[PDB]
A paper describes a structure:
This paratope was dominated by contacts from a 27FAVNN31 motif on CDRH1, a 102TAWW105 motif on CDRH3, and residues N74, G75, and D77 on FW3. The S54 backbone on CDRH2 also participates in this interaction. W104 on CDRH3 forms a hydrophobic stacking interaction with the core N-acetyl glucosamine, while D77 on FW3 forms two hydrogen bonds with mannose C on the [name] D1 arm. While the D1 and D3 arms of [name] interact with the [name] heavy chain, the D2 arm is distal to the binding interface. Wild-type [name] bound to the CH848 TF gp120 core with a KD of 4.0µM, and mutation of the paratope residues eliminated binding affinity (KD>50µM), confirming the physiological relevance of the [name]-[name] crystal structure. Superposition onto five of the published structures identified a binding mode in which [name] may bind an open Env gp120 but clashes with the V1V2 loops of a closed gp120, consistent with co-elution data showing [name] formed a stable complex with an open Env trimer or gp120 monomer, but not a closed Env trimer. We observed reduced binding to [name] by the mutant (KD=14µM compared to 4µM for the wild-type core). [name] binds a glycan-dependent epitope on an open or shed Env that has already bound CD4 and/or a co-receptor and its binding site spans the V3 loop and the base of the V4 loop.
Towards this goal, we have analyzed two cooperating antibodies, [name] and DH272, which exerted pressure on the [name] population in an infected donor, called CH848, to evolve in such a way that it became sensitive to the V3-glycan supersite DH270 bnAb lineage. Cooperating antibody lineages exert evolutionary pressure on [name], forcing the virus to develop escape mutations in such a way that makes it more sensitive to a bnAb lineage. Donor CH848 developed the DH270 bnAb lineage, which targets this epitope, and DH270 lineage development relied on cooperating lineages DH272 and [name]. DH272 and [name] were able to neutralize autologous virions isolated during the first year of infection, but then lost potency due to mutations in Env.
Numbering used by the authors:
A (entry chain L): 1 to 214
B (entry chain H): 1 to 227
Write the structure that this text describes.
């Protein structure tokens, strides 16, 4: 029976407030919920527990800009002053001594923050891989914001789509983003073209890195 | 100093079995009921199982009932999760988590989770392991002394995730960036790790990358030579 629903994704300027909702279903309106924060690429941590009557139990170590509020069957986690530390997926948890139930998950991300351009690195096939009758071109894109990029590949001047494996961007240590693209091809193809190129488009800016057989 | 150290994850076959272990320390463990929470790679949290401190009562989710078995040993403060008849939907990172509230001995109990482990990764797939190949990504021929040159290591075709990469046996952490692996259309993973170094340091300092793929017992130390 017990099922709780959550709010769609959240978006706020840096340092502005944000407020996430966790809604209990019928017959369980008096239940307590707990909030858990999974920052990008890390394990979840316990944030706080709010219950119907108004009590808040927080976890040691969390910043004090997190608070919780109650309205009937509606439990809110409010972040006044939204930081980059606070970005990530927030889940709410309910329990009944016979089972546990988690939320769909709500994502919190800043909006309106300055635009950061990517740095691109292109690696041609190693001679070891060439001797192994194989050839992989490694395009490494890092330190960009926001995490939305599009990659293309080129043999000489003509575009190439066969052999491309591009990852989805993910947050890194400095709250910016990174991705990579791998172009697989035969060593004969590598040696037959003048140059191969990795083209990276981000927020309008299209840059390109180019390597050639030596 | 609360710590939940989980182990026993790996690559298992659809229909196989696997026994997870959680070493719990830093608190009177049997005062609290223990739990298991799993997460698919690109999906949300899902409760799996729970066991009260005495170990005589337990609770499961309908998607794992009768198939999994949570256990507990209080002389060693280790929580176990025995999974039988596994299948694709069970591949996940499994967390071992702790209830915040204690309760009466041997009686039912549950509360909010107050602490999470880092998880242990179980991958249920009929595909088998493979140790990756390793190649040096040499500094480009356009590396003038007095600048930055990028070098690295390419670990190609490995299953399953992940591979750990260090440089010069751990003595080089400055400017190292290891990338999340791409999942190729062949089903195998590939990543590369890159460090950017002073250009004139090439030829004076040798750079060696140390890659480790525990699922296949493959340690590889490759030195990246300028060309």
């Amino acid at each position: 029976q017990l099922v709780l629903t959550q709010s769609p994704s959240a978006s706020a300027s840096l340092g502005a407030s944000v407020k996430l909702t966790c809604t209990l279903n019928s017959g369980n309106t008096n239940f307590a919920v707990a909030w858990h924060q999974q920052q990008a690429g890390k394990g979840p941590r316990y944030l706080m527990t709010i219950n119907s009557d108004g009590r808040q139990s927080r976890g040691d170590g969390i910043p004090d800009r997190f608070s919780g509020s109650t309205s009937g069957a509606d439990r809110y986690l409010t972040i006044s002053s939204l930081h980059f530390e606070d970005e990530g997926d927030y889940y709410c948890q309910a329990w009944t001594a016979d089972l546990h139930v988690f939320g769909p998950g709500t994502r919190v991300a800043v909006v309106g923050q300055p635009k950061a351009a990517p740095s691109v690195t292109l690696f041609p096939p190693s001679s070891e891989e060439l001797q192994a009758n194989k050839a992989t071109l490694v395009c490494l894109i890092s330190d960009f914001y926001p995490g939305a990029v599009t990659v293309a590949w080129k043999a000489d001047s003509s575009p190439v789509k066969a052999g491309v494996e591009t990852t989805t961007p993910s947050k890194q240590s400095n709250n910016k983003y990174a991705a990579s693209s791998y172009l697989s091809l035969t060593p004969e193809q590598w040696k037959s073209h003048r140059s191969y190129s990795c083209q990276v488009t981000h927020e309008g800016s299209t840059v390109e890195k180019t390597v050639a057989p030596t | 100093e609360v710590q939940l150290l989980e182990s026993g994850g790996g690559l298992v076959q659809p229909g196989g079995s696997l026994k997870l272990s959680c070493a719990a320390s830093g608190f009177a463990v049997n005062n609290y009921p223990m739990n298991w929470v799993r997460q698919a790679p690109g999906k949300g949290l899902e409760w799996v199982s729970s066991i009260i401190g005495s170990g005589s009562r337990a609770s499961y989710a309908d998607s794992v009932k009768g198939r999994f078995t949570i256990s507990r040993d209080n002389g060693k403060d280790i929580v176990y999760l025995q999974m039988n008849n596994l299948r694709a939907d069970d591949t996940a990172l499994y967390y071992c988590v702790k209830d915040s509230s204690t309760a009466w001995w041997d009686k039912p109990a549950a509360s909010e989770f107050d602490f999470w482990g880092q998880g242990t990764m179980v991958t249920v797939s009929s595909a088998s392991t493979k140790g990756p190949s390793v190649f040096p990504l040499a500094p480009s021929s356009k590396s003038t002394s007095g600048g930055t040159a990028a070098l690295g290591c390419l670990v190609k075709d490995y299953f399953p995730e992940p591979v750990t990469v260090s440089w010069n046996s751990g003595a080089l952490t400055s400017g190292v960036h290891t990338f999340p692996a791409v999942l190729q259309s062949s089903g195998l993973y590939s990543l590369s790790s890159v460090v950017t170094v002073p250009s004139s340091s090439l030829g004076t300092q040798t750079y060696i990358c140390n890659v480790n793929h525990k699922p296949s017992n493959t340690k590889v130390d490759k030195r990246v030579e300028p060309k």
